[PDB]
Short mmCIF file of C-alpha atoms and ligand atoms in Angstrom, two decimals:
data_model
loop_
_atom_site.label_atom_id
_atom_site.label_comp_id
_atom_site.label_asym_id
_atom_site.label_seq_id
_atom_site.Cartn_x
_atom_site.Cartn_y
_atom_site.Cartn_z
CA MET A 1 -4.36 -29.88 26.49
CA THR A 2 -4.63 -27.79 23.38
CA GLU A 3 -8.03 -25.94 23.21
CA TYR A 4 -9.29 -25.70 19.33
CA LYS A 5 -12.06 -23.54 18.35
CA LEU A 6 -14.59 -25.39 16.05
CA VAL A 7 -17.65 -23.64 14.26
CA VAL A 8 -20.57 -25.32 13.17
CA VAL A 9 -22.37 -23.48 10.07
CA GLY A 10 -25.34 -24.15 7.84
CA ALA A 11 -28.89 -23.15 6.82
CA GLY A 12 -31.30 -23.02 9.47
CA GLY A 13 -32.98 -26.03 10.34
CA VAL A 14 -29.88 -28.52 9.04
CA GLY A 15 -29.38 -30.17 12.41
CA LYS A 16 -26.20 -27.86 13.88
CA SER A 17 -27.88 -27.77 17.28
CA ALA A 18 -28.64 -31.49 17.35
CA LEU A 19 -25.39 -32.62 16.41
CA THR A 20 -23.55 -30.26 18.85
CA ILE A 21 -26.02 -31.54 21.79
CA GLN A 22 -25.57 -35.18 20.65
CA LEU A 23 -21.45 -34.74 20.99
CA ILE A 24 -21.98 -32.84 24.36
CA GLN A 25 -24.98 -34.23 26.01
CA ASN A 26 -25.30 -37.70 24.32
CA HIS A 27 -28.83 -37.29 23.68
CA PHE A 28 -30.92 -36.09 20.59
CA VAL A 29 -32.81 -33.11 21.46
CA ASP A 30 -36.02 -33.01 19.43
CA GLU A 31 -36.85 -29.20 19.75
CA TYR A 32 -33.86 -26.51 20.60
CA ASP A 33 -34.89 -22.98 19.71
CA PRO A 34 -33.63 -22.02 16.13
CA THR A 35 -32.52 -18.80 17.21
CA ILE A 36 -30.03 -19.69 20.09
CA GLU A 37 -26.41 -19.29 19.46
CA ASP A 38 -24.21 -20.79 21.94
CA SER A 39 -20.74 -22.48 22.81
CA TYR A 40 -19.90 -25.75 24.52
CA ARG A 41 -16.62 -27.05 25.63
CA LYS A 42 -15.54 -30.98 25.79
CA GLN A 43 -12.30 -32.66 26.33
CA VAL A 44 -11.35 -35.47 24.29
CA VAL A 45 -8.38 -37.41 23.24
CA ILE A 46 -7.56 -37.95 19.51
CA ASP A 47 -4.87 -39.67 18.22
CA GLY A 48 -3.18 -39.80 21.41
CA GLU A 49 -3.31 -36.20 22.25
CA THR A 50 -5.72 -34.34 24.62
CA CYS A 51 -8.01 -31.63 23.13
CA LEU A 52 -10.26 -29.29 24.67
CA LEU A 53 -12.89 -28.30 21.94
CA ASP A 54 -14.77 -24.98 22.29
CA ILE A 55 -17.60 -25.74 19.81
CA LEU A 56 -19.67 -22.70 18.69
CA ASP A 57 -23.29 -23.79 17.38
CA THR A 58 -24.32 -20.85 15.04
CA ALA A 59 -27.77 -19.37 14.55
CA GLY A 60 -27.07 -17.15 11.39
CA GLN A 61 -27.53 -13.30 11.59
CA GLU A 62 -25.89 -11.58 14.21
CA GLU A 63 -26.79 -8.24 15.77
CA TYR A 64 -23.69 -6.91 14.03
CA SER A 65 -22.00 -8.81 10.89
CA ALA A 66 -18.61 -7.59 12.39
CA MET A 67 -19.64 -10.44 15.17
CA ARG A 68 -19.96 -13.03 12.66
CA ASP A 69 -16.58 -11.80 10.91
CA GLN A 70 -15.00 -12.25 14.45
CA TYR A 71 -16.02 -16.14 15.03
CA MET A 72 -14.97 -16.69 11.80
CA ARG A 73 -11.45 -15.05 12.22
CA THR A 74 -10.83 -17.01 15.55
CA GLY A 75 -12.52 -20.35 14.48
CA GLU A 76 -9.81 -22.93 13.59
CA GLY A 77 -11.90 -25.36 11.81
CA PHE A 78 -15.73 -25.47 10.35
CA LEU A 79 -18.23 -27.81 10.29
CA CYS A 80 -20.37 -27.27 7.08
CA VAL A 81 -23.60 -28.61 7.51
CA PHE A 82 -26.51 -29.63 5.13
CA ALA A 83 -29.47 -31.78 5.07
CA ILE A 84 -29.98 -34.55 2.82
CA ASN A 85 -33.35 -33.63 2.12
CA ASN A 86 -32.92 -29.75 1.66
CA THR A 87 -31.24 -28.99 -1.81
CA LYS A 88 -31.16 -25.19 -0.71
CA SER A 89 -29.08 -26.21 2.46
CA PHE A 90 -26.55 -27.99 0.32
CA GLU A 91 -26.54 -25.06 -2.44
CA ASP A 92 -25.65 -22.54 0.77
CA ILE A 93 -22.47 -24.55 1.20
CA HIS A 94 -20.86 -22.54 -1.49
CA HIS A 95 -21.35 -19.53 0.16
CA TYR A 96 -20.39 -20.79 3.37
CA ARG A 97 -17.16 -21.63 1.94
CA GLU A 98 -16.40 -18.57 0.01
CA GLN A 99 -17.42 -16.50 3.06
CA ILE A 100 -15.31 -18.39 5.52
CA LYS A 101 -12.26 -17.85 3.39
CA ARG A 102 -13.06 -14.49 2.44
CA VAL A 103 -13.20 -13.36 6.23
CA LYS A 104 -10.03 -15.38 6.85
CA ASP A 105 -8.44 -14.38 3.59
CA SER A 106 -6.96 -17.72 3.06
CA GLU A 107 -7.46 -20.78 0.71
CA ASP A 108 -6.73 -23.20 3.17
CA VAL A 109 -9.57 -23.34 6.01
CA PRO A 110 -9.85 -26.82 7.73
CA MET A 111 -13.45 -28.14 7.35
CA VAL A 112 -15.66 -31.00 6.81
CA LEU A 113 -18.68 -31.13 4.84
CA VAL A 114 -21.45 -32.81 6.83
CA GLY A 115 -24.97 -34.09 5.24
CA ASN A 116 -27.15 -34.52 8.26
CA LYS A 117 -30.44 -36.27 8.47
CA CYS A 118 -29.38 -39.27 6.90
CA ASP A 119 -32.06 -41.23 8.73
CA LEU A 120 -35.02 -39.28 6.93
CA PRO A 121 -36.91 -40.47 3.61
CA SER A 122 -36.96 -38.54 0.31
CA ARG A 123 -33.46 -37.47 0.09
CA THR A 124 -33.10 -34.88 -2.35
CA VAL A 125 -28.85 -34.35 -2.45
CA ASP A 126 -27.42 -37.29 -3.58
CA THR A 127 -24.32 -38.97 -1.77
CA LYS A 128 -22.22 -38.36 -5.01
CA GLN A 129 -23.04 -34.55 -5.24
CA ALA A 130 -21.89 -33.81 -1.92
CA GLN A 131 -18.74 -35.97 -2.22
CA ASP A 132 -17.92 -34.21 -5.73
CA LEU A 133 -17.95 -30.85 -3.69
CA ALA A 134 -16.28 -32.02 -0.87
CA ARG A 135 -13.48 -33.36 -3.14
CA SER A 136 -13.41 -30.12 -5.04
CA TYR A 137 -12.72 -28.23 -1.88
CA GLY A 138 -10.02 -30.86 -0.56
CA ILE A 139 -12.08 -31.58 2.63
CA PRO A 140 -13.67 -34.80 4.12
CA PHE A 141 -17.21 -35.70 3.85
CA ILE A 142 -19.39 -37.29 6.04
CA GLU A 143 -23.04 -38.32 6.15
CA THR A 144 -24.54 -38.05 9.76
CA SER A 145 -27.81 -38.65 11.97
CA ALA A 146 -28.27 -36.68 14.91
CA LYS A 147 -31.16 -38.71 15.67
CA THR A 148 -28.91 -42.30 15.71
CA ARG A 149 -25.44 -40.79 16.26
CA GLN A 150 -24.36 -42.02 12.59
CA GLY A 151 -21.28 -40.30 11.67
CA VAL A 152 -21.36 -37.54 14.64
CA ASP A 153 -18.16 -38.41 16.53
CA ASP A 154 -16.61 -39.02 13.15
CA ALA A 155 -17.44 -35.87 11.82
CA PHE A 156 -16.25 -33.55 14.95
CA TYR A 157 -13.08 -35.88 15.68
CA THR A 158 -12.19 -35.71 11.55
CA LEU A 159 -12.41 -31.85 11.86
CA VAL A 160 -10.12 -31.79 14.73
CA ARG A 161 -7.76 -33.96 12.64
CA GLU A 162 -8.18 -31.40 9.61
CA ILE A 163 -7.24 -28.56 12.06
CA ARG A 164 -4.28 -30.36 13.16
CA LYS A 165 -3.13 -30.98 9.66
CA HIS A 166 -3.33 -27.30 8.78
CA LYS A 167 -1.34 -26.24 11.98
CA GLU A 168 1.04 -28.70 11.44
CA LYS A 169 1.83 -27.61 7.80
N1 LIG B 201 -34.69 -37.03 11.94
C1 LIG B 201 -33.70 -36.43 12.17
N2 LIG B 201 -34.08 -35.12 12.31
C2 LIG B 201 -32.98 -34.23 12.61
C3 LIG B 201 -31.66 -34.23 12.59
N3 LIG B 201 -30.84 -33.29 13.04
C4 LIG B 201 -31.82 -32.35 13.02
N4 LIG B 201 -33.27 -32.91 13.28
C5 LIG B 201 -34.40 -32.08 13.32
O1 LIG B 201 -34.31 -31.16 12.35
C6 LIG B 201 -34.78 -29.85 12.93
C7 LIG B 201 -33.92 -28.78 13.06
O2 LIG B 201 -32.84 -29.30 13.80
P1 LIG B 201 -31.75 -28.13 14.80
O3 LIG B 201 -30.96 -28.66 15.29
O4 LIG B 201 -32.69 -27.20 15.34
O5 LIG B 201 -31.12 -27.36 13.41
P2 LIG B 201 -30.51 -26.07 13.40
O6 LIG B 201 -31.39 -24.90 13.05
O7 LIG B 201 -29.42 -26.33 12.15
O8 LIG B 201 -29.67 -25.82 14.53
C8 LIG B 201 -35.39 -30.20 14.41
O9 LIG B 201 -36.58 -30.71 14.25
C9 LIG B 201 -34.54 -31.39 14.76
O10 LIG B 201 -35.32 -32.28 15.82
C10 LIG B 201 -31.39 -35.63 12.13
O11 LIG B 201 -30.23 -36.31 11.87
N5 LIG B 201 -32.28 -36.51 12.05
MG1 LIG B 202 -29.94 -24.44 16.24
#
């Protein structure tokens, strides 16, 4: 077993908690306090190898920004989540990509771009815009719904594969 630190980032309300709780507890939680930051463990086998995932469901500002920097430094891979009906949340991805690279002082940081809430109407962020951005970063892009579970396992397990690829470089 190897333990991997995964960090779920994105604007408030994009579905970080709903995605994480789906993976951990296998249900859609409608209401989970937006101000709670917590971490969860889950063991899974990926490509024949047993992994312990230590997943941080972030909630934004910290008491001290030094704490944010620390979880970015210890985080091995990042799920960068936006909501497909919230253009601002998508534009914020530029900032997350920049910031994480800055804190880690690295050009090569495992990440997956996640466009969540794909079951909702009135999309404002086109799939193509997001695929273009992910391509520009060299990272995977997956659309998800924490409600239906579309893409949820794929997103987390793809991130583990990205972390492994980075480590085996
Ligand atoms: N319909 C739908 N609602 C979602 C989805 N993901 C999150 N939500 C809702 O969006 C709101 C914000 O979700 P939450 O997980 O608290 O977002 P966070 O602030 O990023 O942790 C909540 O009302 C959730 O019920 C999704 O994929 N589909
Ligand atoms: Mg939350």
